[PDB]
Design a protein around this nucleic acid. Sequence first.
RNA 1: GACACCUGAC
DNA 2: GAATCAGGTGTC
Lengths: 136, 135
Amino acid sequence: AKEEIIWESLSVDVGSQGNPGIVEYKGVDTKTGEVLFEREPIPIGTNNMGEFLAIVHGLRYLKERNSRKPIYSNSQTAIKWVKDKKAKSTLVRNEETALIWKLVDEAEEWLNTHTYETPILKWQTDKWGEIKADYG
Amino acid sequence: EIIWESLSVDVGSQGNPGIVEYKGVDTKTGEVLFEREPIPIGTNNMGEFLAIVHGLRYLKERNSRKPIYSNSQTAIKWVKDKKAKSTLVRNEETALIWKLVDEAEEWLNTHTYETPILKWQTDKWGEIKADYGRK
RNA sequence: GACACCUGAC
DNA sequence: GAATCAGGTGTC
Ligand SMILES: [Mg+2]
Ligand SMILES: [Mg+2]
Ligand SMILES: [Mg+2]
Ligand SMILES: [Mg+2]
């Protein structure tokens, strides 16, 4: 009943214009709201692809810094894709969506070839309100 | 890109739901062509819908081929469907707006028209010409 | 149903 | 900053 935000964490989120549409994501320090990583907007992608990329990017980021901090996401889909090490997107694969699909292929490749200690936690929106990395 | 020889429509309110009004203007001159008397209770989208259909009736009487602009994605769809899917309760308090919506639907189901109904591109062009300002 | 991401409108 | 009215897609 008293699950509480772990402040010493990284929170990730996606923002879009359309879905599918222009996608971006960022990772923030949950405690300060400081931006730790982001990607330049991607012309075409889906919310779920974005959420997935943001978690994997977070894994690589924390791994390189030898960090024990957990990552929070609000995306049940992206969390499942990361644990499965496979994104199951329906987005068409063509010249238009080549960038996002390249990134998703790369993220899967990394997952399938590395280990990591980072706990990946569901952000409890119903208990805590909106995630801290939210675009709004 | 803007079709200046057009009629623009928009809605005003106090509350949503609340008191609603709408009007139509010549998109080029700003002249007000019609203005609805404030209706005591209605929704924004009921108003946006009524404004469009009022514009359609106005142009039909004139056999005019000019387009109508609205900024309401919802209302544009409702007029194309001939059905205003409002969530507002229907009772004695909301009788006037629902009589108006019911009659607008009936008009759409009993007339032909060729008027193009266009989305006003608020992002590119700024606020629609029929806008009710700030209070 | 659920978890998300949007679009247009005192 | 807050609220309400409406119509969408991506996924489990
Ligand atoms: Mg999110
Ligand atoms: Mg968000
Ligand atoms: Mg309007
Ligand atoms: Mg307006």
